[PDB]
Swiss-Prot record, chain A:
Organism of this sequence: Schistosoma japonicum
Superkingdom of the organism of origin: Eukaryota
Family per record: Belongs to the GST superfamily. Mu family.
Biological function: Conjugation of reduced glutathione to a wide number of exogenous and endogenous hydrophobic electrophiles.
Binding partners and assembly: Homodimer.
Residues that, per the record, bind glutathione: 6-7, 40-44, 53-54, 66-67
UniProt GO BP: glutathione metabolic process
Misc: There are at least two isoenzymes of GST in S.japonicum.
Protein name: Glutathione S-transferase class-mu 26 kDa isozyme
Domain GST N-terminal: residue ranges: 1-80
Curated annotation (Swiss-Prot), chain C:
Other remarks in the entry: Present with 195 molecules/cell in log phase SD medium.
Entry similarity comment: Belongs to the dynein heavy chain family.
Name of the coding gene: DYN1
Compartments where located: Cytoplasm, Cytoskeleton
Entry function: Cytoplasmic dynein acts as a motor for the intracellular retrograde motility of vesicles and organelles along microtubules. Dynein has ATPase activity; the force-producing power stroke is thought to occur on release of ADP. Required to maintain uniform nuclear distribution in hyphae. May play an important role in the proper orientation of the mitotic spindle into the budding daughter cell yeast. Probably required for normal progression of the cell cycle.
Record's comment describing the protein's domains: Dynein heavy chains probably consist of an N-terminal stem (which binds cargo and interacts with other dynein components), and the head or motor domain. The motor contains six tandemly-linked AAA domains in the head, which form a ring. A stalk-like structure (formed by two of the coiled coil domains) protrudes between AAA 4 and AAA 5 and terminates in a microtubule-binding site. A seventh domain may also contribute to this ring; it is not clear whether the N-terminus or the C-terminus forms this extra domain.
Domain of life: Eukaryota
Subunit comment: The dynein complex consists of at least two heavy chains and a number of intermediate and light chains. Interacts with DYN3.
Name recorded for this polypeptide: Dynein heavy chain, cytoplasmic
Length: 80, 79, 313
């Protein structure tokens, strides 16, 4: 199960979330709660993404941050 | 002359030397500081006077350089 | 495109990430909120630029030994961010290089000097940042350092043996005010500060009022502290001077509320905006000096009664 990091909210990953649900692909979340900012700064830079940021997707050594790099990935994982 | 330079041929030559060429900083020596006012009448408001002995020398010249201020430094002996 | 599918896709990914920065700039550039937004942008910028500084370690250009497309993207961005901040590169020599490297390519360098080059503006002329006819220059950069210093103003505050809290270490802000005020005077000598001129006049009137209250406040602080040694502690001294101690304590109340209201503001500049401050302190110092003068007349009239006291001091 691939890992999707975003605020426990639709935010900048919503489309992607839908696509995933469309391809019936399973995943697990790193959800930032409302007043959970610490937890973020706790992982913010020690994640090894090409640019640290939110949201982030990480699977088979596919580390993506930038909502575009992410969405394109899910899209590409289905030849789209 | 109209500022108050002296009629002397010597003092005209001197002033010409100071003004005409400014690829280098001119060093004025005069016991009677009547020359300090001559340059002041020429550059007017823009004329800012300092001295290498004063406290705020360090900063005031940085302000003078930044905004085109024409500067005369009153104690050339001390540098 | 590059060497292979992988290096070609990598070059495209760089394209994307570069625009996520070049665009980030232009989205806050049309906004009226520019002048304060830049602060938080330039703070984040490092983390983005860093990734490129690394990539540029053991590489001559982005994506290898031959010039690639993403290098021209980042170069546009860079070229634009340096106009906003001249010191965007200073903290990253590897990028300062990458930038000069591009500009060094004979064809490019020959171009920038050619007639074909459109040198400026950076963003559509309407934009707040990098718009308009011709770039301005230093006057703003210095005025920003002045304003920055005054919305950080911090005074050593230390409460002494009794009630009131004292402002220690006067000199530093004392000096800064006078210096930053002399700076604005020298800004009048500059050529391009006529319309930007007006704002500075407002900040000049704000600080010239801060020195108005600075002059009196150090006097008050000194003369109260001095008088406290003399009357604040004993019963015997206040017994001999009853009209004097009844009038000292009345001022002690006022100044106690005036200090604690001014301290909690958290900005010494914000103090000029406070109601009746120059008037209050001018009243306080006047009365404090009438007490000091009354004591002076009392001690000398004490000395004239027993002229030995002249020996004592």
């Amino acid at each position: 199960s691939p890992i999707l990091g975003y605020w426990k909210i639709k935010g900048l990953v919503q489309p992607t979330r839908l696509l995933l649900e469309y391809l019936e692909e399973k995943y697990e979340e790193h959800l930032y709660e409302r007043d959970e900012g610490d937890k973020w700064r706790n992982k913010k830079f020690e994640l090894g993404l090409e640019f640290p940021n939110l949201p982030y997707y990480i699977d088979g050594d596919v580390k993506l941050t930038q909502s575009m790099a992410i969405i394109r990935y899910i899209a590409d994982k289905h030849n789209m | 002359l109209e500022c108050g330079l002296d009629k002397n041929d010597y003092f005209l030559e001197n002033m010409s030397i100071v003004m005409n060429s400014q690829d280098a900083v001119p060093f004025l020596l005069d016991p009677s500081s009547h020359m300090i006012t001559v340059i002041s009448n020429y550059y007017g408001n823009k004329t800012v006077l300092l001295s290498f002995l004063e406290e705020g020398f360090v900063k005031r010249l940085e302000n003078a350089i930044r905004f085109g201020s024409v500067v005369i430094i009153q104690d050339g002996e001390f540098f | 495109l590059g060497g292979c599918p992988k290096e070609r896709a990598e070059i495209s990914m760089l394209e994307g990430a570069v625009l996520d920065i070049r665009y980030g700039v232009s989205r806050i550039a049309y906004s009226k909120d520019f002048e304060t937004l830049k602060v938080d942008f330039l703070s984040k910028l490092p983390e983005m630029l860093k990734m490129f500084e690394d990539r540029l370690c053991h590489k001559t250009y982005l994506n290898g030994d031959h010039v690639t497309h993403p290098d021209f993207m980042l170069y546009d961005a860079l070229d634009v961010v340096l106009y906003m901040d001249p010191m965007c590169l200073d903290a990253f020599p590897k990028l300062v290089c990458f930038k000069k490297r591009i500009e060094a390519i004979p064809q490019i360098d020959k171009y920038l000097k050619s007639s074909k080059y459109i040198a400026w503006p950076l963003q559509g002329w309407q934009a707040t940042f990098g718009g308009g006819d011709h770039p301005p220059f230093v006057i703003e950069k210095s005025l920003n350092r002045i304003k920055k210093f005054w919305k950080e103003a911090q005074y050593e505050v230390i409460e002494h043996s009794s009630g009131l809290k004292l402002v220690r270490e006067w000199d530093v802000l004392e000096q800064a005010c006078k210096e930053d005020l002399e700076e604005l005077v020298s800004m009048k000598a500059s050529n391009y500060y006529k319309i930007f001129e007006q704002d500075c006049l407002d900040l000049e009137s704000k600080l010239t009022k801060l020195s108005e209250i600075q002059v009196n406040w150090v006097e008050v602080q000194f003369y109260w502290l001095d008088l406290y040694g003399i009357l604040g502690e004993n019963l015997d001294i206040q017994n001999f001077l009853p009209l004097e101690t009844s009038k000292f304590k009345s001022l002690t109340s006022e100044y106690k509320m005036i200090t604690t209201r001014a301290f909690q503001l958290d900005t010494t500049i914000e103090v000029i905006h406070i109601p009746n401050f120059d008037t209050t302190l001018k009243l306080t110092i006047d009365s404090l000096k009438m007490i000091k003068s009354s004591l002076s007349t009392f001690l000398e009239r004490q000395r004239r009664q027993f002229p030995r006291f002249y020996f004592l001091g």
